Amino acid sequence: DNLVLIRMKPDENGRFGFNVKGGYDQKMPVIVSRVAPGTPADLCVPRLNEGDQVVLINGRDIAEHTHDQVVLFIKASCERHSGELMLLVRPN
Amino acid sequence: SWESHKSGGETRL
């Protein structure tokens, strides 16, 4: 509950501007650890924030996935809808 | 990993 659905297109070089920590191999939830100024993650509707817990990536439940599996899902450009990365997050 | 910098278990996307 209290979930926020964010869509964002990458910059011209394929970057979104956020960092993540966590994943199944780290025994902790996937959390946004940094959002860089002026990047898609900082300028989206609403902003992606540090501490937000990632629940879905492009509709996919990532609970049992490792950190690097989550990184590849973020970079999987063909799983985006209309070029937008979709994140379903829980604010801290 | 996946052509993104990883350090301290944190990846830049």
Coordinates of N, CA and C in Angstrom, one line a residue:
Chain A
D1 N 0.8 -1.2 0.0 CA 0.0 0.0 0.0 C 0.9 1.2 0.0
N2 N 0.3 2.4 -0.2 CA 0.9 3.7 -0.3 C 1.9 3.8 -1.4
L3 N 1.7 3.0 -2.4 CA 2.6 3.0 -3.6 C 2.5 4.1 -4.6
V4 N 3.6 4.4 -5.2 CA 3.6 5.5 -6.2 C 4.2 4.9 -7.5
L5 N 3.5 5.2 -8.6 CA 3.9 4.7 -9.9 C 4.6 5.8 -10.7
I6 N 5.8 5.6 -11.0 CA 6.6 6.6 -11.7 C 7.0 6.1 -13.1
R7 N 7.0 6.9 -14.1 CA 7.4 6.6 -15.4 C 8.5 7.7 -15.7
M8 N 9.6 7.2 -16.4 CA 10.7 8.2 -16.7 C 11.4 7.6 -18.0
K9 N 11.7 8.5 -18.9 CA 12.5 8.2 -20.0 C 14.0 8.4 -19.6
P10 N 14.9 7.7 -20.1 CA 16.3 8.0 -19.9 C 16.8 9.2 -20.6
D11 N 18.0 9.7 -20.2 CA 18.6 10.8 -21.0 C 19.1 10.2 -22.3
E12 N 19.6 11.1 -23.2 CA 20.1 10.7 -24.5 C 21.1 9.6 -24.5
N13 N 21.8 9.4 -23.4 CA 22.8 8.4 -23.2 C 22.4 7.2 -22.4
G14 N 21.1 7.0 -22.2 CA 20.5 5.9 -21.6 C 20.5 5.8 -20.1
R15 N 20.8 6.9 -19.4 CA 21.0 7.0 -18.0 C 19.8 7.7 -17.3
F16 N 19.4 7.2 -16.1 CA 18.3 7.7 -15.4 C 18.7 8.6 -14.2
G17 N 19.9 8.4 -13.6 CA 20.3 9.3 -12.6 C 20.0 8.9 -11.2
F18 N 19.6 7.6 -11.0 CA 19.4 7.1 -9.6 C 20.3 5.9 -9.4
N19 N 20.6 5.7 -8.1 CA 21.4 4.5 -7.7 C 20.5 3.7 -6.9
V20 N 20.8 2.4 -6.9 CA 20.1 1.4 -6.0 C 21.1 0.6 -5.2
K21 N 20.6 0.2 -4.0 CA 21.3 -0.8 -3.1 C 20.3 -1.9 -2.9
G22 N 20.7 -3.0 -2.4 CA 19.8 -4.1 -2.1 C 19.6 -5.2 -3.1
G23 N 18.7 -6.1 -2.9 CA 18.4 -7.2 -3.7 C 18.5 -8.5 -2.9
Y24 N 18.0 -9.6 -3.5 CA 17.9 -10.8 -2.7 C 19.3 -11.3 -2.2
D25 N 20.4 -11.1 -3.0 CA 21.7 -11.5 -2.6 C 22.3 -10.6 -1.5
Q26 N 21.7 -9.4 -1.3 CA 22.1 -8.5 -0.2 C 21.2 -8.7 1.0
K27 N 20.2 -9.5 0.9 CA 19.2 -9.8 2.0 C 18.5 -8.5 2.5
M28 N 18.3 -7.6 1.5 CA 17.6 -6.4 1.8 C 16.8 -5.9 0.7
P29 N 15.7 -5.1 0.9 CA 14.9 -4.7 -0.2 C 15.7 -3.8 -1.2
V30 N 15.3 -3.7 -2.4 CA 15.9 -2.8 -3.4 C 15.5 -1.4 -3.0
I31 N 16.4 -0.5 -2.7 CA 16.2 0.9 -2.2 C 16.9 1.8 -3.1
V32 N 16.3 3.0 -3.4 CA 17.0 4.1 -4.1 C 17.9 4.7 -3.1
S33 N 19.2 4.7 -3.5 CA 20.2 5.2 -2.6 C 20.7 6.6 -2.9
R34 N 20.5 7.1 -4.2 CA 20.9 8.4 -4.6 C 20.0 8.8 -5.8
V35 N 19.7 10.1 -5.9 CA 19.1 10.7 -7.0 C 19.9 11.9 -7.4
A36 N 20.4 12.0 -8.6 CA 21.3 13.0 -9.0 C 20.5 14.3 -9.6
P37 N 21.0 15.5 -9.3 CA 20.3 16.7 -9.7 C 20.2 16.8 -11.2
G38 N 19.0 17.1 -11.7 CA 18.7 17.4 -13.1 C 18.7 16.2 -14.0
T39 N 18.6 15.0 -13.5 CA 18.5 13.8 -14.2 C 17.0 13.3 -14.3
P40 N 16.7 12.4 -15.1 CA 15.3 12.0 -15.3 C 14.7 11.6 -13.9
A41 N 15.4 10.9 -13.0 CA 14.9 10.5 -11.7 C 14.6 11.7 -10.8
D42 N 15.3 12.8 -11.1 CA 15.1 14.0 -10.3 C 13.9 14.8 -10.8
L43 N 13.6 14.7 -12.2 CA 12.7 15.6 -12.8 C 11.3 14.9 -13.2
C44 N 11.2 13.6 -12.7 CA 10.0 12.9 -13.1 C 8.8 13.3 -12.2
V45 N 7.6 12.7 -12.6 CA 6.3 13.0 -11.9 C 5.8 11.9 -11.1
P46 N 5.9 11.9 -9.8 CA 6.6 12.8 -8.9 C 8.1 12.4 -8.9
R47 N 8.9 13.1 -8.2 CA 10.3 12.8 -8.1 C 10.6 11.4 -7.5
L48 N 11.6 10.7 -8.0 CA 12.0 9.5 -7.3 C 12.9 9.9 -6.2
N49 N 12.7 9.3 -5.0 CA 13.5 9.8 -3.8 C 14.3 8.8 -3.2
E50 N 15.4 9.2 -2.6 CA 16.2 8.3 -1.8 C 15.4 7.7 -0.7
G51 N 15.6 6.4 -0.5 CA 14.8 5.7 0.5 C 13.6 5.0 -0.1
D52 N 13.2 5.4 -1.3 CA 12.1 4.7 -1.9 C 12.4 3.2 -2.2
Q53 N 11.5 2.3 -1.8 CA 11.7 0.9 -2.0 C 11.1 0.5 -3.3
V54 N 11.9 -0.2 -4.2 CA 11.4 -0.6 -5.5 C 10.6 -1.9 -5.4
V55 N 9.3 -1.8 -5.8 CA 8.4 -3.0 -5.7 C 8.3 -3.7 -7.1
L56 N 8.1 -2.9 -8.1 CA 8.0 -3.4 -9.5 C 8.8 -2.6 -10.4
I57 N 9.4 -3.3 -11.4 CA 10.1 -2.7 -12.5 C 9.5 -3.1 -13.8
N58 N 8.9 -2.1 -14.5 CA 8.2 -2.5 -15.8 C 7.2 -3.6 -15.5
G59 N 6.5 -3.5 -14.4 CA 5.5 -4.5 -14.0 C 5.9 -5.7 -13.3
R60 N 7.2 -6.0 -13.3 CA 7.7 -7.2 -12.8 C 8.1 -7.1 -11.3
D61 N 7.6 -8.1 -10.5 CA 7.9 -8.2 -9.1 C 9.4 -8.7 -9.0
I62 N 10.2 -7.9 -8.3 CA 11.6 -8.2 -8.2 C 12.1 -8.7 -6.9
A63 N 11.1 -9.1 -6.0 CA 11.5 -9.6 -4.6 C 12.5 -10.7 -4.5
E64 N 12.5 -11.7 -5.5 CA 13.5 -12.8 -5.3 C 14.7 -12.6 -6.2
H65 N 14.9 -11.4 -6.8 CA 15.9 -11.2 -7.8 C 17.1 -10.6 -7.1
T66 N 18.3 -10.9 -7.7 CA 19.5 -10.4 -7.1 C 19.6 -8.9 -7.6
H67 N 20.6 -8.2 -6.9 CA 20.9 -6.8 -7.3 C 21.1 -6.7 -8.8
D68 N 22.1 -7.5 -9.3 CA 22.5 -7.4 -10.7 C 21.3 -7.8 -11.7
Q69 N 20.5 -8.7 -11.2 CA 19.3 -9.0 -12.1 C 18.4 -7.8 -12.2
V70 N 18.2 -7.1 -11.1 CA 17.4 -5.8 -11.0 C 18.1 -4.8 -11.9
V71 N 19.4 -4.6 -11.9 CA 20.1 -3.7 -12.8 C 19.8 -4.0 -14.2
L72 N 19.9 -5.3 -14.6 CA 19.6 -5.6 -16.0 C 18.1 -5.3 -16.3
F73 N 17.1 -5.6 -15.4 CA 15.7 -5.2 -15.7 C 15.6 -3.7 -16.0
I74 N 16.3 -2.9 -15.2 CA 16.3 -1.5 -15.4 C 16.8 -1.1 -16.8
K75 N 17.9 -1.8 -17.2 CA 18.5 -1.5 -18.5 C 17.8 -2.3 -19.7
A76 N 16.8 -3.1 -19.4 CA 16.1 -3.8 -20.5 C 15.2 -2.9 -21.2
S77 N 15.7 -2.1 -22.2 CA 14.9 -1.1 -22.9 C 13.7 -1.6 -23.6
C78 N 13.6 -2.8 -24.0 CA 12.4 -3.3 -24.7 C 11.2 -3.7 -23.8
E79 N 11.5 -3.7 -22.5 CA 10.4 -4.0 -21.5 C 9.8 -2.7 -21.0
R80 N 10.2 -1.5 -21.6 CA 9.6 -0.3 -21.3 C 8.4 -0.1 -22.1
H81 N 7.4 0.7 -21.7 CA 6.3 0.9 -22.4 C 6.4 2.4 -22.9
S82 N 6.4 2.5 -24.3 CA 6.5 3.8 -24.9 C 7.8 4.5 -24.5
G83 N 8.9 3.7 -24.3 CA 10.2 4.2 -24.0 C 10.4 4.6 -22.5
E84 N 9.3 4.4 -21.7 CA 9.4 4.8 -20.3 C 9.7 3.7 -19.4
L85 N 10.7 3.8 -18.5 CA 10.9 2.9 -17.4 C 9.8 3.2 -16.4
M86 N 9.1 2.1 -16.0 CA 8.1 2.2 -15.0 C 8.6 1.6 -13.7
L87 N 8.5 2.4 -12.6 CA 8.9 1.9 -11.3 C 7.7 2.0 -10.4
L88 N 7.4 1.0 -9.6 CA 6.3 1.1 -8.6 C 7.1 1.1 -7.3
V89 N 7.0 2.2 -6.5 CA 7.9 2.3 -5.3 C 7.0 2.6 -4.1
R90 N 7.6 2.3 -2.9 CA 7.0 2.6 -1.6 C 7.9 3.7 -1.0
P91 N 7.4 4.9 -0.8 CA 8.2 6.0 -0.1 C 8.5 5.5 1.3
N92 N 9.7 6.0 1.8 CA 10.2 5.6 3.2 C 9.3 6.2 4.3
Chain B
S1 N 27.8 -3.7 -12.6 CA 27.6 -4.7 -13.5 C 26.8 -4.2 -14.7
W2 N 26.7 -5.0 -15.8 CA 25.9 -4.6 -16.9 C 26.2 -3.2 -17.4
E3 N 27.5 -2.9 -17.5 CA 28.1 -1.6 -17.9 C 27.7 -0.4 -17.1
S4 N 27.3 -0.7 -15.8 CA 27.0 0.3 -14.9 C 28.0 0.2 -13.7
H5 N 28.4 1.3 -13.1 CA 29.4 1.2 -12.0 C 28.7 0.7 -10.7
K6 N 29.4 -0.3 -10.1 CA 28.9 -0.9 -8.9 C 30.0 -0.7 -7.9
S7 N 29.7 -0.2 -6.7 CA 30.7 0.0 -5.6 C 29.9 -0.1 -4.3
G8 N 30.4 -0.9 -3.3 CA 29.8 -1.0 -2.0 C 28.4 -1.6 -2.2
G9 N 28.2 -2.4 -3.2 CA 26.9 -3.0 -3.4 C 25.8 -2.0 -4.0
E10 N 26.3 -0.9 -4.5 CA 25.4 0.2 -5.0 C 25.7 0.4 -6.5
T11 N 24.7 0.4 -7.4 CA 24.9 0.6 -8.8 C 24.3 1.9 -9.2
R12 N 25.0 2.6 -10.1 CA 24.5 3.9 -10.7 C 23.8 3.6 -12.0
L13 N 22.6 4.0 -12.1 CA 21.7 3.8 -13.3 C 21.4 5.1 -14.0

